[PDB]
Design an enzyme around this catalytic site. Structure first.
Site, PDB file in Angstrom:
ATOM      1  N   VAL A   1      50.046  85.978  -8.274  1.00 39.36           N
ATOM      2  CA  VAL A   1      50.300  85.560  -6.910  1.00 39.36           C
ATOM      3  C   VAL A   1      51.410  84.504  -6.873  1.00 39.36           C
ATOM      4  O   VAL A   1      52.245  84.558  -5.973  1.00 39.36           O
ATOM      5  CB  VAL A   1      48.969  85.035  -6.300  1.00 39.36           C
ATOM      6  CG1 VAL A   1      49.162  84.558  -4.862  1.00 39.36           C
ATOM      7  CG2 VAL A   1      47.954  86.177  -6.262  1.00 39.36           C
TER       8      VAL A   1
ATOM      9  N   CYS B   1      45.467  86.662 -12.164  1.00 41.66           N
ATOM     10  CA  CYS B   1      45.919  86.770 -10.786  1.00 41.66           C
ATOM     11  C   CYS B   1      46.552  85.517 -10.232  1.00 41.66           C
ATOM     12  O   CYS B   1      47.404  85.655  -9.360  1.00 41.66           O
ATOM     13  CB  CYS B   1      44.789  87.136  -9.840  1.00 41.66           C
ATOM     14  SG  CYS B   1      43.156  86.655  -9.990  1.00 41.66           S
TER      15      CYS B   1
HETATM   16  S1  CLF Z   1      40.043  81.329 -13.383  1.00 49.60           S
HETATM   17 FE1  CLF Z   1      37.932  81.592 -12.725  1.00 49.60          FE
HETATM   18  S2  CLF Z   1      37.438  83.537 -13.581  1.00 49.60           S
HETATM   19 FE2  CLF Z   1      39.752  83.501 -13.510  1.00 49.60          FE
HETATM   20  S3  CLF Z   1      40.417  84.584 -11.649  1.00 49.60           S
HETATM   21 FE3  CLF Z   1      40.299  82.367 -11.478  1.00 49.60          FE
HETATM   22  S4  CLF Z   1      38.234  81.954 -10.515  1.00 49.60           S
HETATM   23 FE4  CLF Z   1      38.256  83.992 -11.597  1.00 49.60          FE
HETATM   24 FE5  CLF Z   1      38.279  87.816 -11.846  1.00 49.60          FE
HETATM   25  S5  CLF Z   1      39.919  89.122 -11.098  1.00 49.60           S
HETATM   26 FE6  CLF Z   1      40.395  88.890 -13.295  1.00 49.60          FE
HETATM   27  S6  CLF Z   1      38.855  87.410 -14.052  1.00 49.60           S
HETATM   28 FE7  CLF Z   1      40.902  86.233 -13.467  1.00 49.60          FE
HETATM   29  S7  CLF Z   1      42.464  87.938 -13.453  1.00 49.60           S
HETATM   30 FE8  CLF Z   1      42.058  88.168 -11.279  1.00 49.60          FE
END
Ligand code: CLF
Ligand code: CFM
Ligand code: CFM
Ligand code: CLF
Ligand SMILES: [Ca+2]
Ligand SMILES: [Ca+2]
EC number: 1.18.6.1
Lengths: 522, 468, 522, 467
Positions: C156, C152
């Site tokens: 974004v 994500c």
């Molecule tokens: S680096 Fe760390 S674990 Fe990654 S997102 Fe960022 S805070 Fe979370 Fe949750 S939802 Fe999935 S795993 Fe990512 S792509 Fe969007």
């Protein structure tokens, strides 16, 4: 009373107050029942080591046996042959019981006849019963072969099966060349596995003893496989499967897997598949014969070696890692077929399952029972898993088998606290799981009554039953499972680790009490 | 149609050798039949033996006694917890019904005899099971054949230990089916147990004392009967065999009336209590509302006006409940046809319960009935229905192929045959692990069970879509 | 303290008196814990209908979801191709989690890289990370293909994957002809299944889009099978097995069953099996393409129909009796192969199991959850067994899917008391199993916490979990199971009837209380 | 040794493109190394993110608060009950650790923003979970990128509901690993929770009040530590994070000494309490008998003669027990070699317990350690052993192939690789669903677990008797 939208069956109907009251009243007015405080006192006494010493002193009384009688075995052997009718010469009650016993375990039709010998036949012998019985069975049920065994009535009065069948043939009740193998199977000698052995050797003699003149060992280039008394369809299935993977020509002699698993498609098939008469006649021509369950195939081994001249390999039941390896390597040696890439991978996948699951299996203590060969294979696989086979009971084992298992146990650190019991029954086993409580029992459905007794002492004393064996009557379709080969070892591994993990989840399910260890990931 | 069934019978019989053919023709009838004869050799009887009749059905259920299957290991093991004769007790300490006690005869016992062994195991029963209240020894085939004297062992050890030890010579070669085992078992109760309290005057009798004779409490069947009788104001002093205790048997001499449900197995001891103690007995039927109501009023009429008032109170109490059951289940089963085959009572006794759900029993028969059972059946069956005594596997499969019933109700050795043929099957011995089927609470379960099986979604799936 | 001969792990060590007292003191001195009476009060309030109404009014808060995010699915799709590396362009914490999530379910290595976009890439884009990322992965792990998806972060900040891969090739970081398929997989749209679809459609476009003039539909005489997000090895295996029994040429596109089950034989294999690039390039030439899980393969259906011009058959997931029949019959039609006698037998053996087990299954009520296609297949099979799928929840389900299942429920008397919930989660389901208590839940391991909550209200209210789905983390090796075809139908039926019978035995194990119904034979 | 290891390092590095090669070279050393730099792209680091460091390890364990994984569904789902930070509670009612509360961002929230959604879910949390004692909102990647201000929402709703609502900016793109998430998490406790009772004087202190700082009670680890300190006469007012409550943390300003177990995750807040409240802090080690004894005696020396006497009573009581453990298991593990790779404390901290069973750690390394951690490691490791910082999957496999350790202790993403290679593997994060491993009672479990795996019969069966 019943509420029409939620009908209660016996459980929970009889917990309703009016029934509880009615049963309390029956007890109190007419049963002259011992007071509950006395019942609890005697219950606690039956869990003690003092009770156990007197229990093990029994010599005349047997309580909850873990074996059945010879003709049961003979019927299952006979059902493995193409269009064969198992026929037990003796009294009819026995047959109704053998059929129901297998009906309940396989949940399938089990066709078998009797020749209904009655009181008058005790005084005069059962010859006429043999003559009309065979004739009626042939005409009514159209078997291609009728395989005859006996009940103890017929055994005690001394009926000569050979003479009786020969006289049926002489007097034209059955055609002279119609196949009628026989075996005397006295229920007061050995157990159900002895009856399978006796029947198999009798069928083998029938088709080969007088034909040996033209047989050359190795000329059909197949290996004969004799399964023994086997009640898991997956075991017949996996043996055939691995031999086909290896390109090994084989002949499974006694194969009931089709008659014990017919499709419900609108018609009843009385007979299906099975070893053909042509395969039994050609069996001396095989390179060799492998006995999958050697400890109850003694008579057969002596005939295969003495008359067919096959040097029967000294192989254990193909259960667990090491004994499936030995089995495949010996088959390769005899057929000259390489063990294929598929089987080496299946082996590695079992070893991979053992590495994943080892921390939960390590040091888990088991009480277990069953027939000689199944039990030693289970002990062997448990030692390979790093488990401790603490109470090994085989009611129908013998002294030489016990010597073999004690040698297997002596070879592992995990056999140090194990003791093999032969001649002992499930009431003997009940005491052992109270005094030297294991973690689990691996057994057949009669084991449920021992789990019930251990829970009555208290939940911390409860020993859960892991159903592997025969008969399994209180669960559906476990007879389709596999306990042999890497496949069977994989299934047993999965059932053991998961039985341990379900018990841990139960013990840690209490909110704010034990659920700190109720892990999502294990 | 009468002629159609009659030609069906000749047709099926064509397969037999003449000996068999002529005998079996006497055992198949359109309603005129014979019964209780030898089974023809090799024709795959559904019948059991005299030990099944004695140990398996009359004695086995008595909960506080220990029953020894004396002989080889087969019989006790195959009968271990096969029949669902329910009981309340602590098994292994004061109750012993689902356990298998055996003398596991080896060859030394066949050759030398098993009487010293019996004696030594009565001692072992006494050390390891101190709260047992009597012992019976159920003979298997070899006991009689080798000439053992189980009566002398029982009398000598009985006297030595001051305990009831009952020798039962129900060796499976005796008789022609489970039937003679009932009789042998009824006479062993008569001779070694029933008279124990004949000189005892301390039981306080009431005018309403009754005993349920011949209900083995399959799935709780006797409990669902007993509750109705006691709501009607009667006192059930004994339940013969299902959840039965030995003192209830010994107290049955004090009742005013014996209520016989299973006539075939218990008419013998009923006749005896009438000739020796003057106790009258009557046959009744607690299967379905019509028969339970009929029976409740018949039983009540043998007493007085207060019990007859209570009978009408009980009938009014359960009336909304069974009416709710037929309102739900009769539309679902109306006009469906049933073929039955069971032992010696239920072939005729459940017919009314099927009719209360608007079903039609087009065929029925018994494994071990005698001609008085058939006389009783005449009246319960329709016109031109099929009757079969000791049906062979072959005949039963053949009759079903032609009659094409919607539901078949019989035993475990028949179950999986007809299910593969696509006919709904309900076990009418073990109730397919459901029940109770007796009384008004039993009718609710019976109705639910016939429905769940006859109208189950799986029956429409037997032909593969590409097989048409 | 510890006894060295009987070492105690956390359960039961913290139940020792000194620990019990220490925890009580911790609580009382410093936790300012709510009174137990208030805790019980709030627990009982959370079991009521009032609480349920409030819970179903949630618009913003999700509690205990029953789905994961898009790139998890993309990684599983990528793992199914020969010697490929799944590469998620974005931030690394995501990949650590994806890898652990699958390691825990398969108990196997799950290889996947990240190109570690940090803080500054949020301002300047992740281009350099793609360039060095691809290059380093290529040289270090030597895959024959890298399959790119996105976290994500990268979504974004709008990184153009396409331009970035093209510029990596342009600058010489990776060879121009090196296969680098990509897919934008936003964790804020759909769920893990959408990621599988997006990744598959991206790999399909890559080997096919600009090559179409050379293709004739039907010329290779094969049928393409797209598995969808699949986490049972037995489901991949049973599809190939039945298609080979039929003599049907096929191509399973995305096949991970080898990489997710390597032998433990002394060496680690990073890659194994999988669909070849050659199978993917030749896939336009197939007779047709069958989508085993169509409700989450929408984008793929549009691409195979639009570009490959295949008339994708309208088939449901091959689960249960009817939909395995329809699948087999459609495959027969498309390929002209007759359905063999083996599969006709196997079908009848399933029907035979349904007839033996129907009295225990009839009218049993279940609450269940999972992915759209799995859920409807289980609903269908439950109706075929005469069971009632009372609470059907699919967190990632959509409106049209809900309509389909409601119509499936309407065509059965067993669907009368059933409701389909989409967008709802396991805290929503927790309420439903309290207010309209079913007999069992069929779900994944998160469902263990719902079972814990029901037991806390009382044993009479406990709803047992039957573990079928993804993820299963607290039992070992159940990922080797099958839920598709007659094979999987046979496994589901056995697990369901036996879960019912194990619960009946638990309920009737009470000596002199409920054990009048503890039957040896059921 | 020495020469061979440097030969191994340069050989393994020869697969990299040069930028990767020159960086990785600086992160592999023979016992000299740099740390806490960014991971080289595409090399399969074992590292996690700042959210894992904040939600997964510092905040997640606080049992009576609700922690919202704010952003899309992935992160809160993959972290749900993955770490075994144990606690006593009634989950879903007064305790919430194993649950997954999330704002499940859909595209409208990426476009319009998720701040109104956060406010409406804070109200939903309050109606549905009334017994919660505070809320934290753990930001996942999108929150900062999108321009949301969770601080404003937290202050406004906190005020409105008289609730502690902690905004945590632990978006996964911040930092280079789980490490900056610890730091963000410590600063969020500082700014929003720790000062709440500063003008409050009703807590009756005693001279023996202590708090365990940085023990997340994996498998009950802090419980096996707490019992020993209190048997020594100390009062542990708080447990920071494992089985922790919010009032315990608010009460920590009142203690006499802060006992730091995990230096990497908790040194920031310890430094703060020394500056603002004058509370001293000391590092200790409760892994294995040698270190636990060293630690109990050093903590006791900070107090008086009575705590010092009770310290010797505690050591004396447990002495027969840990001696029976080493007598049984040390003959079974003596001379076996271990390679470790874990996060930021345990790589150096379990070495003394391995040596107590006669084993030798021949290689260790950390995912997210900083240079002060490596300074501390230096001492604990023998000369010529292998050090690796942020090891790649490739390097770890290559180092194992050459060194052939008898046991590898690392995490779940590493487990099944090495088990297929025939090396015994023990999980040294989750303790392989076993434990506790702290204190004397944990040593007993550690010892039998190393033994059950290193000496398991399955390892002898990896090659078929035909090959
Ligand atoms: S680096 Fe760390 S674990 Fe990654 S997102 Fe960022 S805070 Fe979370 Fe949750 S939802 Fe999935 S795993 Fe990512 S792509 Fe969007
Ligand atoms: S087959 Fe009853 S005379 Fe006897 S076991 Fe069944 S139809 Fe018997 S009603 Fe009864 S409880 Fe029976 S069902 Fe008379 S007892 S020998 Mo098999
Ligand atoms: S990898 Fe500890 S600095 Fe942190 S989750 Fe494990 S080596 Fe963490 S000791 Fe702890 S409880 Fe840990 S094991 Fe410091 S808390 S970010 Mo993975
Ligand atoms: S008709 Fe009946 S059941 Fe048969 S024996 Fe006779 S009393 Fe018994 Fe028990 S052991 Fe086996 S089954 Fe027989 S052959 Fe010897
Ligand atoms: Ca069947
Ligand atoms: Ca694995």
């Amino acid at each position: 009373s019943q509420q029409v939208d939620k009908i209660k069956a016996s459980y929970p109907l009889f917990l309703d107050q009016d029934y509880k009251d009615m049963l309390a009243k029956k007890r109190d007015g007419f049963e002259e029942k011992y007071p509950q405080d006395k019942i609890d006192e005697v219950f606690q006494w039956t869990t003690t080591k003092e009770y156990q010493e007197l229990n093990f002193q029994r010599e005349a009384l047997t309580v909850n046996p873990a074996k059945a009688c010879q003709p049961l075995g003979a019927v299952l052997c006979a059902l493995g042959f193409e269009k064969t009718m198992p026929y037990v010469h003796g009294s009819q009650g026995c047959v109704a019981y053998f059929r129901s016993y297998f009906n309940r375990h396989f949940r399938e039709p089990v066709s078998c006849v009797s020749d209904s010998m009655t009181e008058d036949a005790a005084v005069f012998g059962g010859q006429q019963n043999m003559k009309d019985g065979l004739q009626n069975c042939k005409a009514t049920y159209k078997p291609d072969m009728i395989a005859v065994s006996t009940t103890c009535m017929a055994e005690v009065i001394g009926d000569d099966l050979n003479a009786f069948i020969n006289n049926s043939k002489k007097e034209g009740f059955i055609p002279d060349e119609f196949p009628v193998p026989f075996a005397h199977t006295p229920s007061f000698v050995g157990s159900h596995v002895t009856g399978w052995d006796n029947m198999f050797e009798g069928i083998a003699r029938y088709f080969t003893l007088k034909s040996m003149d033209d047989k050359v060992v190795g000329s059909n280039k197949k290996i004969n496989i004799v399964p023994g008394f086997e009640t898991y369809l997956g075991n017949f299935r996996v043996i055939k499967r691995m031999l086909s993977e290896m390109g090994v020509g084989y002949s499974l002699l006694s194969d009931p897997e089709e008659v014990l698993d017919t499709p419900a498609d609108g018609q009843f098939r009385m007979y299906a598949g099975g070893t053909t008469q042509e395969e039994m006649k050609d069996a001396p021509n095989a390179l060799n014969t492998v006995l999958l369950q050697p400890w109850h195939l003694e008579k057969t081994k002596k005939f295969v070696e003495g008359t067919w001249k096959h040097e029967v390999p000294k192989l254990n039941i193909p259960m667990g890692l090491d004994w499936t390896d030995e089995f495949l390597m010996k088959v390769s040696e005899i057929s000259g077929q390489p063990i294929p890439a598929s089987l080496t991978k299946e082996r590695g996948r079992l070893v991979d399952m053992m590495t994943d699951s080892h921390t939960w299996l390590h040091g888990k203590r088991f009480a277990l029972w069953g027939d000689p060969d199944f039990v030693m294979g289970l002990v062997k696989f448990l030692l390979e898993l790093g488990c401790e086979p603490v109470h090994i009971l085989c009611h129908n084992g013998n002294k030489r088998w016990k010597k073999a298992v004690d040698a297997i146990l002596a070879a592992s650190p995990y056999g140090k606290n194990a003791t093999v019991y032969i001649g002992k029954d499930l009431w003997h086993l009940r005491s052992l799981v109270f005094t030297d409580k294991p973690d689990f029992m691996i057994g057949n459905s009669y084991g449920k009554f021992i789990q019930r007794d251990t829970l009555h002492k208290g939940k911390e004393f409860e020993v859960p039953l892991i159903r592997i064996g025969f008969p399994i009557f209180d669960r559906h379709h476990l007879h389709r499972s596999t306990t042999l080969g890497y496949e069977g070892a994989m299934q047993i591994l999965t059932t053991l680790v998961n039985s341990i993990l379900e018990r841990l989840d139960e013990e840690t399910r209490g909110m704010q009490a034990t659920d700190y260890n109720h892990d999502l990931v294990r | 149609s009468r002629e159609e069934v009659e030609s069906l019978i000749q047709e099926v019989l064509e397969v037999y050798p003449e000996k068999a053919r002529k005998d079996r023709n006497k055992h198949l009838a359109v309603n005129c039949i014979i019964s209780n004869k030898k089974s023809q050799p090799g024709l795959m009887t559904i019948r059991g033996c005299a030990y099944a009749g004695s140990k398996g059905v009359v004695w086995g259920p008595i909960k506080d006694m220990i029953h020894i299957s004396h002989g080889p290991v087969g019989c006790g093991q195959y009968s271990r917890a096969g029949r669902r004769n329910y009981y309340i007790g602590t098994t292994g300490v004061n109750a012993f019904v689902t356990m298998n006690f055996t003398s596991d005869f080896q060859e030394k016992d066949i050759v030398f005899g098993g009487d010293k062994k019996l004696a030594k195991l009565i001692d072992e029963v006494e050390t390891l099971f101190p709260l047992n209240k009597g012992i019976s020894v159920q003979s298997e085939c070899p006991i009689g054949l080798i000439g053992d004297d189980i009566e002398s062992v029982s009398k000598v050890k009985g006297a030595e230990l001051s305990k009831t030890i009952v020798p039962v010579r129900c060796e499976g070669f005796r008789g022609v089916s489970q039937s003679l085992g009932h009789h042998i078992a009824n006479d062993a109760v008569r001779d070694w147990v029933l008279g124990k309290r004949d000189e005892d005057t301390t039981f306080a009798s009431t005018p309403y004392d009754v005993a349920i004779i011949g209900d083995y409490n399959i799935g709780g069947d006797a409990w669902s009967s007993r509750i109705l009788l006691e709501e009607m104001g009667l006192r059930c002093v004994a339940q013969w065999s299902g959840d039965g205790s030995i003192s209830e048997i010994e107290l049955t001499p004090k009742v005013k009336l014996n209520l016989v449900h299973c006539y075939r197995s218990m008419n013998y001891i009923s006749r005896h209590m009438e000739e020796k103690y003057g106790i009258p007995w009557m046959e009744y039927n607690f299967f379905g509302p019509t028969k339970t109501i009929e029976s409740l009023r018949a039983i009540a009429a043998k007493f007085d006006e207060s019990i007859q008032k209570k009978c009408e109170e009980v009938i009014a109490k359960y009336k909304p409940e069974w009416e709710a059951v037929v309102a739900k289940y009769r539309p679902r089963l109306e006009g469906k046809r049933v073929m039955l085959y069971i032992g010696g009572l239920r072939p005729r006794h459940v017919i009314g319960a099927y009719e209360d759900l608007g079903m039609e029993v087009v065929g029925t028969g018994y494994e071990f009935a005698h001609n008085d059972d058939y006389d009783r059946t005449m009246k319960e069956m329709g016109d031109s229905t099929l009757l079969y005594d000791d049906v062979t596997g072959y005949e039963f499969e053949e009759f079903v192929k032609r009659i094409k019933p919607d539901l078949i109700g019989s035993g475990i050795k028949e179950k999986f045959i007809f299910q593969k043929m696509g006919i709904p099957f309900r076990e009418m011995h073990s109730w397919d692990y459901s029940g109770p089927y007796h009384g008004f609470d039993g009718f609710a379960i019976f109705a639910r069970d016939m429905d769940m099986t006859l109208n189950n979604p799986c029956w429409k799936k037997l032909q593969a879509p590409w097989e048409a």
